[model samples]
Target: MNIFEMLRIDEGGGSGGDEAEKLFNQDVDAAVRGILRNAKLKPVYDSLDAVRRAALINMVFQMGETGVAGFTHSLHALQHKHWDHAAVHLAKSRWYNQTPNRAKRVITTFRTGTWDAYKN
Candidate 1:
């Protein structure tokens, strides 16, 4: 079952739905934090500014930590602080093609090291 379905099963009655969603969000945040902490890209991830860090975490969340970790070239570029190359590698992936708008926003932030040009 999907997470929402699982949540509904656990908290289906009497205003519990809202609480379930809140709890779900909290769980997602915790999972993301864990992924970041255990990532192979930890040093590079830690070196990033907060906005860049959040973008990386969002990508890791969407792809799963293992999947994000598999982007070796992208990770290498990030490790070397090659912002343009890192963005290019990100954009070249199937992940980018599958989610162009979202990837563009993240890639822009990655390339520029700021969220000034980001948009949903």
Candidate 2:
């Protein structure tokens, strides 16, 4: 699921009041920072690409803490060193299958590792 779906935010919905904006921003900040902290718990990379980070964030947002721990396929793929296969698998999962456009974008990200376009 994407961030909008995970958080149930309406992309084209009407705006809320300033108070609502503050509250929403606060919640988003906490959620994002928590993910960053956990990402750091993993191996240290010279630079964490936004798209890769976004993929993980979507996973976490959907599955919660337990969900992240239960991602056996991704971990196994990493261990087995099958990047393409793993990417295809991810693109074919229930999450991706729910949205054809999203699946295409994620598959492209898996193949190209680009952070621009198709992010929505």
Candidate 3:
């Protein structure tokens, strides 16, 4: 079942029927595009590979842009291509504590610039 069905929301045109999926894709697309346009974020984001870029967009989309942007040290490390340092900076966050495994995976992507699943 879709999210609305699981949540007991009515499945309508814009509910869980079809627009929900469309809206989800659109939202992700907007987040990706939005990150590329962010004055303070685009440079670091643009310097990364596709895998790392997607991971960056993932965090920005999950957390709001402002929240993601607050990672000053991590972003700085990334700006300098300090992959391991960037991951370490990111690992020292409440966000990492809230979801350690998932954050670890994303941090791994940042540090390696490669894609993988189910690993720190």
Against the hidden reference, what TM-scores do the models get?
Answer: 0.73, 0.55, 0.78
Q: Rate the local accuracy (lDDT) of all candidates.
A: 0.69, 0.51, 0.71
- Ranking of models by TM-score: 3, 1, 2
Q: Which runs of model 2 end up more than 4 angstroms from their true locations?
A: 1-14, 33-48, 76-82
Q: Identify the runs in model 1 with alpha carbons over 4 angstroms from their true place.
A: 1-24, 37-39
Single out the weakest 10-residue window by summed lDDT for candidate 1. 1-10
How would you encode candidate 2's per-residue C-alpha lDDT over 1-120 as one tens digit per residue? 344433443223246877866665565565555555654413311133555555455455444544454546764553344657667677656766776565565455545656443535
TM-score of 3: 0.78
Give the clash count for each candidate.
Answer: 0, 0, 0
For residues 1-120, write the lDDT of model 1, one tens digit per residue. Answer: 332332233334246577766776775576467656765767768787766776677676567777888888888888788989888778889998988876787788788876554322
RMSD to truth, every model: 7.5, 5.2, 6.8
Better of 1 and 3 by lDDT: 3
Q: Highest TM-score: which candidate?
A: 3
Candidate 3 residue 72 Cα shift, in angstroms, is 1.2
lDDT of 1: 0.69
Candidate 3 lDDT (Cα, 0 to 1): 0.71
